[PDB]
Structure formats: C-alpha cells, structure tokens
C-alpha cells in the first residue's frame, strides 16, 4: 500500500460550487485562498492537520474566515469573525462565526448581526436586533 | 447536480512517499527541497513542478520531476542515481524516462558493470548497460 506524509502549502486557491491512500500531511492555508460556495464569498487561511488511516479521514486544526460576506435569503451581511476549530471529525467543526448586515445592503429586513457557535450539527445561533 | 471547481497553487515543502510491498480542478504543484521517496529499492529525492488537471473526461497531468540525488537497490548491487528526469505529457502513468545511475566495477577483474540507462515510456522503457561509467 501506498502513504504520503508531509507540509503542504497553499499560497493561492479559488474554490466555487455553481448551483446552475494513507496520509498524515499539515496543511497550511495561504494568503489568498477564497471560496464561493453556498452564498459565502469569503477569503479563508489557517492550518490543518490532516490524518488518514484505516479508521478514515481527521482533521486537527483551525480555519479562519478574516473576511466575507454571505449575500443569500434576503441577508447579506459581513462576516466579523469566523473560526471554524477541528477536532477529528471532518463534518463537525466547532463554530465560532458573527456576521452583520451590510449597511450598503439593498435587500430591507436583513438581521443587525447574527452570531453561530457550536458543534456544526449542534449549532446555536443568536440574532441581534438593531439598538 | 451542482459544478465543484479548484484552481490554485500548492507547494510541498516536505514529503515521504512510501511505497510498501462532477468536479473540474486545475492546481499547479511545485515539488520543493525536502521531497523523498522510498519504493522499489529505490531511495531518491525528487523536485520539479506538476499541473495536475481534471474535468469530466479524465485527469491529465504535465510538468517534469527530477532526481537530484537517489540510489537503487538492485541484486546484490547498489548503483547511485547521476541524473534523473521523468517528463510527464498527460498521461498520468506513464511519463518518459531519462535515468542514469552508477557503480563502480574496477575492485575486481570480473566486474564489468559501471552503469544503467533507463529510457523512453516508463511502461516500454529500454534499459542499457555500460562497462565504461562514461555512457557516451
């Protein structure tokens, strides 16, 4: 069988989702690394542990979201702050992500702020209202 | 059914490659100093650069891999990788090769072997053996 380990670097990706074998590698996310998906577009950096095995696939680490905006529903706000913490299972990160509405947005009805937090199949959300 | 895209560049600083016993992606992959392989009694480093790409037809890949330093394990013998290239033109598993290495045979009367080229598509490749270490 065959296995890769290593540092991987990652100066530069774009990533976009259009709607129309073992491993242990550390992999840390750049300086221009942005994704479209989902209605975030967002520019992402941190580090990653990625362990594969027979068990399957981990991920140890942190990634950041230093800038966004998600723009989608009705709501377009401004990402604040955004960390997502993993700590093995690849689709359950803990949240950590406050976003607030764009006071160039031209959509009425867009929330104040919103904060989520929470294992990302446990989440809590909390909606602000305007002072 | 949605459309997954990836384009980017990827760097890898470090690496061992052991080898025992609808998404569309355009990525750039430079091999960096500190890349090695152990597979097949070979123990090599390699450098180079890859373009790694992949859409509905299949995945290509073109760059070049070079071999700044290895050995090979061969029979009893060890032979010393002097140059070392595989040129990769879509294909995936199957660059062409252009390996040199060698020994040296002048303890012993009897020994004639100073050294092996390996060229051509890795999967017909030719292989020719010189008693003289110079290969020209």
Redesign the interface.
Known sequence: ????????????????????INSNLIVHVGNN?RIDAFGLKARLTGDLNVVQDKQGLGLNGQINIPEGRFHAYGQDLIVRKGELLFSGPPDQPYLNIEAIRNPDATEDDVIAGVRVTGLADEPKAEIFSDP
């Open positions: 069988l065959f296995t890769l380990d290593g540092r991987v670097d990652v100066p530069w990706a774009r990533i976009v989702v259009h709607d129309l690394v």
